Design an enzyme around this catalytic site. Structure first.
Site, mmCIF file in Angstrom:
data_model
loop_
_atom_site.group_PDB
_atom_site.id
_atom_site.type_symbol
_atom_site.label_atom_id
_atom_site.label_comp_id
_atom_site.label_asym_id
_atom_site.label_seq_id
_atom_site.Cartn_x
_atom_site.Cartn_y
_atom_site.Cartn_z
ATOM 1 C CG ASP A 133 19.354 38.420 38.311
ATOM 2 O OD1 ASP A 133 20.805 37.964 38.582
ATOM 3 O OD2 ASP A 133 18.872 39.035 39.810
ATOM 4 C CG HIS A 166 13.742 29.804 43.335
ATOM 5 N ND1 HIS A 166 13.081 30.865 43.842
ATOM 6 C CD2 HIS A 166 14.019 28.420 43.795
ATOM 7 C CE1 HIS A 166 12.895 30.392 44.909
ATOM 8 N NE2 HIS A 166 12.897 29.032 45.034
ATOM 9 C CG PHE A 191 56.212 45.441 28.452
ATOM 10 C CD1 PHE A 191 55.504 44.864 27.304
ATOM 11 C CD2 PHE A 191 57.325 46.511 28.566
ATOM 12 C CE1 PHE A 191 55.261 45.485 26.202
ATOM 13 C CE2 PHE A 191 56.282 47.565 27.888
ATOM 14 C CZ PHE A 191 56.080 47.500 26.698
ATOM 15 N N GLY A 238 59.459 52.056 34.187
ATOM 16 C CA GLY A 238 57.826 51.602 35.185
ATOM 17 C C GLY A 238 57.515 51.120 35.995
ATOM 18 C CD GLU A 280 55.562 47.657 37.447
ATOM 19 O OE1 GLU A 280 55.953 47.701 38.297
ATOM 20 O OE2 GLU A 280 56.177 47.092 36.735
#
EC number: 3.2.2.5
Lengths: 469, 469, 467, 467
Positions: A114, A152, A354, A397, A401
């Protein structure tokens, strides 16, 4: 925990943390880690094929020989189609895979077909280099964040996959010439964590044979493994427990030790423990200050400078959102450190500013908020400072946060004597604590440090160090 | 330039720039590059030893066999003492070594015993991992900035050095088991630049024998070399030129091409050419703005934002001194880019802020100025903007950074329509230009862009692109 | 000088390797150039001019051959070795002597087939090995193998000539030669002949022996090389270089003998052949009447003599003569049945049938086989030599002259009579060697009817000749 | 089913490999367990209990042996193989038949020494190879080599038993076995005997043959295995598993014959021995008088018969009889001189001396050698059989009974007289086989004085017996 090769959870964690502390940690993974994600065990995968040639999968002890006989009667393609099909499933990685991606593991070796192990890294910030043929191992490369060896083979090229008995016989001769020496080297130099494996796997003998290099008495190297303890439900309990004991004592000859869980969920409990304890090496810093409360401007500037500097001196990584009044001097302190000791700043600081005007001319708030969460989930500590402007008594802010750090389980370290949203978080959060280590760090940081900055920064540094042990 | 395997300087540079553009560039170096630094050729180094056993070094055609006979008569230690002595000299690296350090070369292979090649990197910002025994090649490692393979050993362990004939015979059996395959891999995957070598070396046949992998018709790989053309002073000029021609045509069988200089100084001329042309991929940005001249504050902020963004879009690295009014928005633009395309900022931006309060409580100006020069010598372009404060008509730092860029040969790109020290640099420097490419870039950047920012940023971007070709 | 040895030391140690069948031979150009082949300097002269280089100025002929192969394609050297190396030249006396010696493993760098044919010019069945496919597995049948490391003239496109032919050695081709050569080098004792430090491919050749540098190596090997000559310029200097080079070889367990003319090689091989031949003896005679003995006594004297000759580890060559040879077979058969051995290991017969198998004359073929058989023996014992009325049997006297032709030590017995006694009367007066005379005296002593004393006399005379 | 073959197909292809000396033998536990050794299940039962595991529940006995070696140190398994595998058991009839066959290369996984002693129980000189030091280089002298892949009972500390003994195979020890086995597998045709898909070490054993999967493999090998039995539970299922497993072997170029009882192995080997023995013939007789022939004619009839028997590639065993055997030697010597061959390659003699070498009775030893020599022959030809006054020579008649004991095809000649003719009168009435009778008729035809017609009759009778 006295059977030879058996170890306790705390023993395992201690040695693993040594390997992490020395960047000597790698991971070796098998089918047992992908089956819980939704993939088929080989027994069932070979049931219908077994019936397709006139044999019962319940009667065959060696499924590898079964796959060989099947490849003979029904041409090899019919196994490629079996793997191309039943292993290319649109499955999500498990939580174990994500925790492994979050750890400082640069080398991954796996026997399953996988691609979950690569996706867990692609979902995180890491960009793996998955290697499947010798041509990729030739020479050397330094660039990629991690290497995923598909020992493998892989489901993208099943005609070359290692499945049948003769695929193990022809391992290294017609195919995979260089895998053997690269694997032996990694085994003698790295400390490996073994996970998705069981003594009852069908491919086990062939897998363990590669470790013959670890039988040299001059090996000195230790590796660690996890497996499920035998359970009452399992018939012949005492007998299978004796078999499993002797199997672990045989394993320990190759320098591999074992921890035993009772259900596979317990695996995650350890991985998470290692992620959290490692995350505390990375700190998140929040705040915004037009004014620096009881400190003068230059004094509030140099306090931040000397705090980020001291945090770099003690070997801690910083993530900051480059806030008003705060970020310039977090950067200034870390730059002072890196210039003092001719170090590189990007090794210590990751920023998340920002922007104001998207050049593209499109809103980026969604992307920015996701980047912020991705950075924060890599952090283990949150320190809050100031959080005020001319029109913001409680900067928004900073509170946003804090709620975000509260989501990701960060240890929150608000500083009371800075005021603003930082002090609001102290006044609210201090009622929501219960652990000794966290409480000790909070008290050690908010002390009455005389206003004097040297003791003030230390208080916080010791509060950080306390949470690391 | 029609003898088989011969190439022109422009051919060499083109192919090397392909290898650089694809991170496939490595370097292979020998004794010919360290002798100009002050080290002894092997002929003279073996003169007194030759006399110490009763043989004349002028009479022996094969110095390797001579070193063997010497090691037999005078015990091996007496050659270790010869190398421990005459190769541990306190010598400075050459300019070629520094230019090689400045290039994007991550893999170095060498046959000489000196340590100049490591020091050129340690002097630059790079931290090499010098490998000398198999134990270091086992497994894999991703960490270090560059790997320096000491193929024939090193002066720190001369008892293991590859010197005598039987040291070549025992190469890979008793010692250096893994060097062969790692070298063959690097030769088949990287594009290598060969320098300090000559067909007349004493160890040549043994050196070239390792490249037998390149004789496979399926090699397709090309490498490049530099050697001195035969000179009139050399007696038997025409005959030695024929020998050298056939030697190059034999070399080309291994996929190696050759450029021929007439004096070794010419080597540096090429290396420098490649450094300069590569440096222009890295840009230096200077300035400081309390006020943004004819632009409003938000407009002067978003102009810088959109300039750094566009510079990142076109694949250019930025070095900035985080100036007042300028650095916050250089960072903001690059952060907007990296957040738009889920890229990492440290891949595009390196900063050099100017701290206010050294935490140690000691002046750091000397260290800061040296860091600044180290960053600037890695840059190839200098763009200047604004450079004004309330009390600074001509900001000092901007002029100081212009004189510093003028020292390191940076292409200076002042912007006239920003005013301040930037415009002072335009008014002064425009009289000191002579090259077409530079003049074309300067004109393309300072255009009357209507004040409108999209055309304004483009003008500059095209000026940058012009200097790269 | 370390690694130099005496001629008698050389012969002694080599004969030790012979005593244990641990002897092999390593051969080079020094044995094929004297037969008529061209040295490489001259062989490359015209090619060298064909690319603009002088063989007089180029010291590295291997790199020179590479440059030529580069400008003029491989085929033109395939044609070169096909030409001046395909000369059908007869092997030298050294080659025939090596054929007569018990050397079963031959390794050579030469491109010619001189040593292989020299073995074919004998009872030997050489198996030339040049490709991996022949080294695969195991085989015991063939009489001896000639390993051609650097290829053969029948397939010059694979010959090892240029530098890159050495670089690609063992990777694309001749993959198994490396390990098999190392095995023979670690187990057998090898005698090196046609080589000199001044060869052009020496640096490349010596690398193959790197396994002998392992300190765990007990094996010793031996070589023969040309001593420096005063006429040679830089005489003392070349003596010093060669001295240090001889000390360099000894690291691989190789010792050196130094000749002054190439003839000495033949002198040593010849010596070793002679001293080896005496382990196998030829017996002549025929007894229509059993002189000095009763019939049964003359029969059992021969029987009990051949038995003891087999007990002492000596091989017998007999012409199955009537009355003399007839009972040699019975005696050796009694020995081999006593000691669970096989008869052909001790007895080789040379009979003369009465009627040609299907109508063809065999006299010439018989005598050719006979002369070659006698050249394999080192001692010739003569007995009886009488027929129905012939006091001096015809064949026996000519066989005395034939053993005298091939230099065999002649050991006739007087107390048997006949042509044997006439040969005894001739040989005792026609000898000069002390050892030969002493052995003859030890043999012709007598007690008489006591046959053990006679058998002793003869056997001890043989051992005297082997000291 | 792919990879299954007929018994006669098996014999034919195996006899092709015999015709070219390309035949080797690969042997396992299936040949040593019937001799008296313990199967591994039982051998590990008490150890299994000694660590708390049941051999009845553990399918992987190799991993089981590893676990036991881990808890109880290596020495205790060194002692285990030393014990129940050091039984001094006699080799089986299969082993003796393999000794009689021309198999020069033997590879085995067994820890016992049955096949080695079975070869020692013969004229064979086995060389057992177990360590790399013995595989080094080259050697041709020994009569045959027995390769012991998984070690030997004399050095069990090196035996390959546990799993990690297979993992460390070729790295620390037995480094050269891998390439030498691959060589023998790619050049010789191997006959596999003592193995079954149900062995415990099979997965490990088969990996060694991976070289035979190279599509460039032309070589075919052959094996014999036990067919499934109705009584066996899951009969049809085990038949399907075994069928697919037989088709799996053929990837390595291995074909399979299926027996219903292990006795069939002996039946096939025996058959192959009989049909091989007829290439070598025994001749009996003695002619004091040359009946029906003049003296010279009776001498040259024997001479010219042995010559033609050598021309047709048949080996002769003779007791060097007076008047009959005496001239067989001359005839074959004429052949070998005509065709530049060596005599012992075509003639093996069995003489009877007159006087013991130094005073010991040899009658018993002589007859033991004789019986073993006759067991090596497949045809017995009788001639003359007369003495000074004995119309029916003594030895010849008992030799008729002796050939009848060892099952040799008896081919007496009537027109020679003597004991040969009495044996002719007895044998013609005491036979029942069509081929034997047809060959006897082809032999006793006659033109008379024309000897070529007689020699033809006899030679063609031999070829009839070999079809």
């Amino acid at each position: 925990f006295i059977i030879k090769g058996e170890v306790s959870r705390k023993d395992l964690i201690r040695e693993i943390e040594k390997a992490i502390k020395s960047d000597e940690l790698g991971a070796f993974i098998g089918a047992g880690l992908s089956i819980p994600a939704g993939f088929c065990s080989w027994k069932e995968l070979l049931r219908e094929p077994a019936e397709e040639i006139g044999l019962d999968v319940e009667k065959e002890s060696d499924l590898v020989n079964l796959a060989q006989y099947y490849s003979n009667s029904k041409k090899r393609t019919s196994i490629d189609d079996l793997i191309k099909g039943q292993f290319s499933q649109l499955v999500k990685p498990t939580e174990n895979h994500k925790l492994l991606s979050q750890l400082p593991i640069s080398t991954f070796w796996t026997t399953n077909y996988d691609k979950l192990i690569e996706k867990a890294l692609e979902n995180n910030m890491k960009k793996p280099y998955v290697k499947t043929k010798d041509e990729q191992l030739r020479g050397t490369n330094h660039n990629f964040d991690a290497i995923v060896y598909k020992l493998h083979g892989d489901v993208e090229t099943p005609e070359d996959a290692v499945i049948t008995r003769s695929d193990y016989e022809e391992f290294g001769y017609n195919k995979r010439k260089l895998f053997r020496e690269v694997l032996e080297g990694d085994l003698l130099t790295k400390t490996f964590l073994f996970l998705g494996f069981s003594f009852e796997d069908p491919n086990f003998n062939y897998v363990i044979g590669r470790l013959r290099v670890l039988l040299d008495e001059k090996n000195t190297r230790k590796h660690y493994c996890i497996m499920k303890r035998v359970q009452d439900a399992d018939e012949d309990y005492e007998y299978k427990k004796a078999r499993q004991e002797l199997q672990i004592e045989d394993l320990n000859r190759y320098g591999i030790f074992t921890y035993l869980v009772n259900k596979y969920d317990e695996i995650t409990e350890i991985l998470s423990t290692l992620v959290d304890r490692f995350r505390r090496k990375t700190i998140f810093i929040s705040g915004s200050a037009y004014s620096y409360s009881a400190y003068s401007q230059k004094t509030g500037e140099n306090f931040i400078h000397k705090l980020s500097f001291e945090l770099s001196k003690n070997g801690y990584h910083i993530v900051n959102g480059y806030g008003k009044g705060v970020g310039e001097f977090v950067l200034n302190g870390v730059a002072d450190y890196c210039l003092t000791h001719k170090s590189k700043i990007n090794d210590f600081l990751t920023l998340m500013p920002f922007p104001q005007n998207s050049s593209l001319g499109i809103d980026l708030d969604k992307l920015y908020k996701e980047n912020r969460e991705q950075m924060i989930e890599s952090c283990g500590i949150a320190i809050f400072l100031f959080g005020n402007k001319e029109a913001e008594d409680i900067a928004s802010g900073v509170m946003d946060e804090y709620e975000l750090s509260k989501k990701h389980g960060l240890v929150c370290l608000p500083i009371e004597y800075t005021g603003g949203a930082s002090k609001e978080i102290y006044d609210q959060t201090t009622q929501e604590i219960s652990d000794k280590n966290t409480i000790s760090a909070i008290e050690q940081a908010n002390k009455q440090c005389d206003g004097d900055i040297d003791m003030s920064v230390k208080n916080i540094v010791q509060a950080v160090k306390i949470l690391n042990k």
